[PDB]
Ligand binder design. Structure first.
Ligand SMILES: Nc1ncnc2c1ncn2[C@@H]1O[C@H](CSCC[C@H](N)C(=O)O)[C@@H](O)[C@H]1O
Ligand SMILES: Nc1ncnc2c1ncn2[C@@H]1O[C@H](CSCC[C@H](N)C(=O)O)[C@@H](O)[C@H]1O
Ligand SMILES: CN(C(=O)c1ccc(Br)s1)C(c1ccccc1)c1ccccc1
Ligand SMILES: CN(C(=O)c1ccc(Br)s1)C(c1ccccc1)c1ccccc1
Lengths: 321, 321
C-alpha cells in the first residue's frame, strides 16, 4: 500500500535545487571524502549515499528505518556499488557499525515533529559514530522570518465579493467568515510564496551548528529569538513566513541550500503564520517580536509574540500534529 | 475550525460550469417555478435556493444539516430574501415542512459514500415532500466508462529512467516499484483527464430516472451494466475513467451538465480505475466488461470484470472509505 512512499521520494528527487545542492555540496568535499568512510542517516532511495561514492568514499553505510530501504538495496546493487555502499535497515539509534566514520550526510530538514526527531537521530549518530572533528553534510542550519502579504490568500478572501459580478447573487457578507476560517486557526500552513509577498528584509532568528555538543540539551529549551524590521510599502500584512537554509562546507567557500521565497522553489516551500485578521502596514512601519520553536499529545509548538506599528503586542501560538 | 468548510464551498462556487448549469437549468423552468414552492436539499451557502427565487418561486425551503447553514442564513438575509427563502437547519429526513412542494433542487452528485447517501436523502425527500408529477432538478443522471491512457501517470512511471540524464545515477530499476505503488492499489483515484487520454468511444453503463419509485429498492442491488468498445490507436492503457452527467428538463430541449474529459473541466474531474499494470492496445482492440457500483466497514465497492484484446477476463474490485 506504498503510493505515499513513492510520492515523497519522487517529490525530493524531482527537486533539482535540493538534489543538485547535495550533489555539489558532497562533490566539493571530494578531498576529505576520497578513501574515507561515510554514514548516510535516512538514506531513503540511496541517492545521497551514491553521491558520496561518486565523491570517492571507500565505504558508505546507508541506514534507512522505513520500507524504502529495499528500493535503496535494489538501486545500489543495480549501480554495481554493493561492495562500497552497505544499506542497513532499521533506526540509526540501534545500528551496529564496525568502525567510527569520517563523515555523516543527512536530509533531516522540514516542518513538523518527523523533522525535529530526524535531527535528534542525526545528533545521536554524530555523538555515537562520528570521529573527533568529523565532517557533517550539511554542517549548519539558519532560520529566517519576515512579514508577508499572501496574494493567493488575498484572492481567496475577496472571492466572495466577485460572485455578484458573475452569478447575480451578493455573497460579500461571507468575507468575515472566510477570514475567521482561513486566518483564525492555529495551524502552520506550508505554502510557496514569491518575492513580491515579502514586506521587509528577512531577519535570521536562529543558527544551529550541528558540530556543537549540548546542542541536544539546548534544543530542550527550544530554538528561537527576537526580530525587528521595517516594511517597504503599503500592504495588507497576513502574518509571517519562516524558512531555513543549510550550509555544506567547501573544498572553496561554503555552499548554501536556501528555501527562501527570493530563491528558486523547493518541495519545502515556506512555513506561514497567519494573524487572526489582516493588518494594513505602510512604508517604515516597525514589525518586531519573538519566536520560539519547541516540542510538547506529542506536538511541535510555535510561540509568537509580535508588535505591528502603534498596535499593542499580541501572542499567537501555533502547533503541528 | 472551519477552513475545510470554506475550501469546499469556494471550489463549488468557483466551478462556473457547475454554477451556470444550475443557474440556467433552474431559470429555464421559470414557467413551472414562478409563484410555486421549492425544497433545496443541502442548500450549502444557499446559492441554488436564491436561483430558485430569481426564477420566481414564491417560497423556497433551504435545508442544510451542517454548520454552513448559518452562512446560508446570513446570505439570504443580506440579499433581502428571508420573506421568500427559509433556511432550516438539520437533516431533510426529519425537517417539518408546512406544505408539500412543487419542485426539489439538489447538488448530491460526486464520488464516495457521502454522495451515495446524499442521493438517498434526495429520494427520501421526493417520496415524502414532492407532489405527484413534481419537478426534480436535476431529473436524471447517466454514467459513462472508457479505456484511458493517463499522461500524468505515464510521466510518473518514466521519471525513474530520467534520473541518469540529470544526476548521473541509474534508478530505472524502480519502474517496477512505482507501477506496483501507483497502479497496484484498490483505490478510486479522482483526477482530471483530457480528451487525448481517451482510447475509445465512451459507453453509457447506467441511467437513473430520479422520478421513478423503486429506484431506492433498485439501488440495493447496485447500479451498473455491460460495456464494449474498440480502441482508436496504439497506446499503453492504464485502466478506465468513469464520469456522470445530469439533466435539467427544459422550458425547450433539456440542459446537460457533463463531467466528461471532452467537456470543460469541473471540480468533480473523473474517477480513475487503474489496472495493476499497463497493457498495450492497438487500433480496433476490443475492450469489454461489467461494472457494478454498490455500498458495503461502511464502504462503496466498485466491481469490475473486464477483457482487453486476446488477454483473459480479469476482475479488479475497488473501494472508497
Ligand atoms: N532514526 C532513523 N534511522 C534511520 N532512518 C530514519 C530514521 N528516521 C527517519 N528515517 C528515514 O529517513 C528518511 C527521510 S527522507 C530521506 C531522503 C534521502 N536522503 C533521499 O535522498 O531520498 C525516510 O526514508 C525515513 O524513513
Ligand atoms: N440529509 C441531509 N439533509 C440536509 N443537508 C444535507 C444532508 N446531507 C448532506 N447535506 C448537506 O448538503 C450539502 C452538500 S454540498 C451543497 C451544495 C449547495 N447546493 C451549494 O450550492 O453550495 C452539505 O452542505 C451537506 O452538509
Ligand atoms: C523541525 N523543525 C520544524 O519543524 C520547524 C521549522 C520552522 C518551523 Br515554523 S517548525 C525545526 C526545528 C528543529 C529542531 C528543534 C525545533 C525546531 C527546523 C530547524 C531547522 C531547519 C528546519 C526545521
Ligand atoms: C455516489 N456515487 C459514487 O460514489 C460513484 C460514481 C461513480 C463511481 Br466509480 S463511484 C454514484 C452512485 C450513486 C448511487 C448508488 C451507487 C453509486 C453516483 C451516481 C450518479 C452520479 C454520481 C455518482
Amino acid at each position: 500500500e506504498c503510493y505515499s512512499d513513492v510520492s515523497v521520494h519522487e517529490e525530493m528527487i524531482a527537486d533539482r535545487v535540493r538534489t543538485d545542492a547535495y550533489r555539489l555540496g558532497i562533490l566539493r568535499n571530494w578531498a576529505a571524502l576520497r578513501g574515507k568512510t561515510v554514514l548516510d542517516v535516512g538514506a531513503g532511495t540511496g541517492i545521497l549515499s551514491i553521491f558520496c561514492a561518486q565523491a570517492g568514499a571507500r565505504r558508505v553505510y546507508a541506514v534507512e528505518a522505513s520500507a524504502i530501504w529495499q528500493q535503496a538495496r535494489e538501486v545500489v546493487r543495480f549501480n554495481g556499488l554493493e561492495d562500497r555502499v552497505h544499506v542497513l535497515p532499521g533506526p540509526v539509534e540501534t545500528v551496529e557499525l564496525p568502525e567510527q566514520v569520517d563523515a555523516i550526510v543527512s536530509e533531516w530538514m522540514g516542518y513538523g515533529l518527523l523533522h525535529e526527531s530526524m535531527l535528534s537521530s542525526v545528533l545521536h549518530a554524530r555523538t555515537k559514530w562520528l570521529k573527533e572533528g568529523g565532517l557533517l553534510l550539511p554542517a549548519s542550519a539558519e532560520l529566517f522570518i519576515v512579514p508577508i502579504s499572501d496574494q493567493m490568500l488575498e484572492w481567496r478572501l475577496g472571492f466572495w465579493s466577485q460572485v455578484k459580478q458573475h452569478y447575480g447573487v451578493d455573497m460579500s457578507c461571507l468575507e468575515g467568515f472566510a477570514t475567521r476560517c482561513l486566518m483564525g486557526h492555529s495551524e502552520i500552513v506550508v505554502q510557496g510564496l514569491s518575492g513580491e509577498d515579502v514586506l521587509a528584509r528577512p531577519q535570521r532568528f536562529a543558527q544551529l551548528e550541528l558540530s556543537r555538543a549540548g546542542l541536544e540539551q539546548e534544543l530542550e529549551a527550544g530554538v528561537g529569538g527576537r526580530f525587528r524590521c521595517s516594511c517597504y510599502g503599503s500592504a495588507p500584512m497576513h502574518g509571517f513566513a519562516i524558512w531555513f537554509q543549510v550550509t555544506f562546507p567547501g573544498g572553496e567557500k561554503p555552499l548554501v541550500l536556501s528555501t527562501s521565497p527570493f530563491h528558486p522553489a523547493t518541495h519545502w516551500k515556506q512555513a506561514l503564520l497567519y494573524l487572526n485578521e489582516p493588518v494594513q502596514v505602510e512604508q517604515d512601519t516597525d514589525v518586531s517580536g519573538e519566536i520560539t520553536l519547541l516540542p510538547s499529545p506529542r506536538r511541535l509548538r510555535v510561540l509568537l509574540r509580535y508588535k505591528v506599528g502603534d498596535q499593542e503586542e499580541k501572542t499567537k501560538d501555533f502547533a503541528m500534529e
